[PDB]
Paper text:
We present a structure of the kinase domain of Abl, determined in complex with an ATP–peptide conjugate, in which the protein adopts an inactive conformation that resembles closely that of the Src kinases. Unexpectedly, one of these structures of the Abl kinase domain has a striking similarity to the conformation of inactive Src kinases (DFG-Asp In, αC-Glu Out). This is the first time that the same protein has been seen to adopt both the DFG-Asp Out and the αC-Glu Out inactive conformations. The conformation of molecule B is dramatically different from all other structures of Abl determined to date, all of which adopt the αC-Glu In conformation. The central result of this paper is the discovery that the kinase domain of Abl can readily adopt a conformation that resembles closely that of the inactive Src kinases. This is a surprise, because all previously seen conformations of the inactive forms of the Abl kinase domain have in common a flipped DFG motif (DFG-Asp Out/αC-Glu In), whereas the DFG motif is not flipped in the structures of the inactive Src kinases. The side chain of Phe 382 can then move through the sizable hydrophobic pocket created by the outward displacement of helix αC. Throughout the flip, the negative charge of Asp 381 is stabilized by the backbone amide groups of the activation loop and interaction with Arg 386.
The improper activation of the Abl tyrosine kinase results in chronic myeloid leukemia (CML). Our results suggest that interconversion between distinctly different inactive conformations is a characteristic feature of the Abl kinase domain.
Residue numbers in the entry:
A (entry chain A): 232 to 502
B (entry chain E): 105 to 112
The structure:
Amino acid sequence: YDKWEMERTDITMKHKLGGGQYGEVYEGVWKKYSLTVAVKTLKEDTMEVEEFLKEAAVMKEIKHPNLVQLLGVCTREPPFYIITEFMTYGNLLDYLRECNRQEVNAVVLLYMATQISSAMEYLEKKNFIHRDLAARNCLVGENHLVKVADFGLSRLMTGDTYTAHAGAKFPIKWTAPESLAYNKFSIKSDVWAFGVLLWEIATYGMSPYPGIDLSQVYELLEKDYRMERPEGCPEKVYELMRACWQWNPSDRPSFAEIHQAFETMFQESSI
Amino acid sequence: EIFGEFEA
Ligand SMILES: *NC(=O)CSP(=O)(O)OP(=O)(O)OP(=O)(O)OC[C@H]1O[C@@H](n2cnc3c(N)ncnc32)[C@H](O)[C@@H]1O
Ligand SMILES: [Mg+2]
């Protein structure tokens, strides 16, 4: 793994950009190339170094125009650092909440969805489960470029795998029914999450199931409740949204089908 | 709040 195993001193750390459940993110500079990169400093963890690297090797092969590339990892000193390509406009959630809606119009929202579906079709092809698909994990570049990031990150940390609490911790409103029930994930659970992401995009970054307590979500879903069509959301996009939320994962469309659907919508809408 | 605990 010499092509991507780095040393902390290989990168100049700058300001903190933010952080999440896995660690903090900083803007950094890969000295060798005077290249600005994103540096995620993972929390202290117990995961086997061998298991970590094998997982990271898989991620290193994820190469697509709409997936944030893994550039390297610093593993000589635990906790490990994850170096990825720097996205100039931050996460998609904040982007949508602060954007100029006349600029980021219906065609742009469609473009963003198209890009994300392309990236996911690729992950599906690689049988790579993202497990954290959501607007917070979509990053923005120049000219409305959108890239899916932090795919499979959960498999690089043991973290709170085990707790004495009853039940488990989840980003509940993005979690497919079967995942909540069994704490197991698949490409299909990523499809369900993609549906919630579409809703996030359609609403310019609103929090899903507004007014519904997290603890009430599963029951509602079991009884067929689903978020209603967002204001201004095209009927066909909502249709896809609803297909993503089929109770049986088997009944949900594949990302290849979703991407094809969006490419068509994007084409027609281009005119 | 994004995270919450869920007991099946
Ligand atoms: N339980 C969950 O919700 C899982 S997702 P998460 O890790 O808990 O939180 P998340 O919002 O995804 O953020 P993360 O720690 O991944 O930090 C994201 C923030 O840091 C900056 N960031 C991250 N990757 C970046 C790249 N590649 N380029 C520029 N900036 C990046 C962003 O500001 C983002 O909000
Ligand atoms: Mg993230």
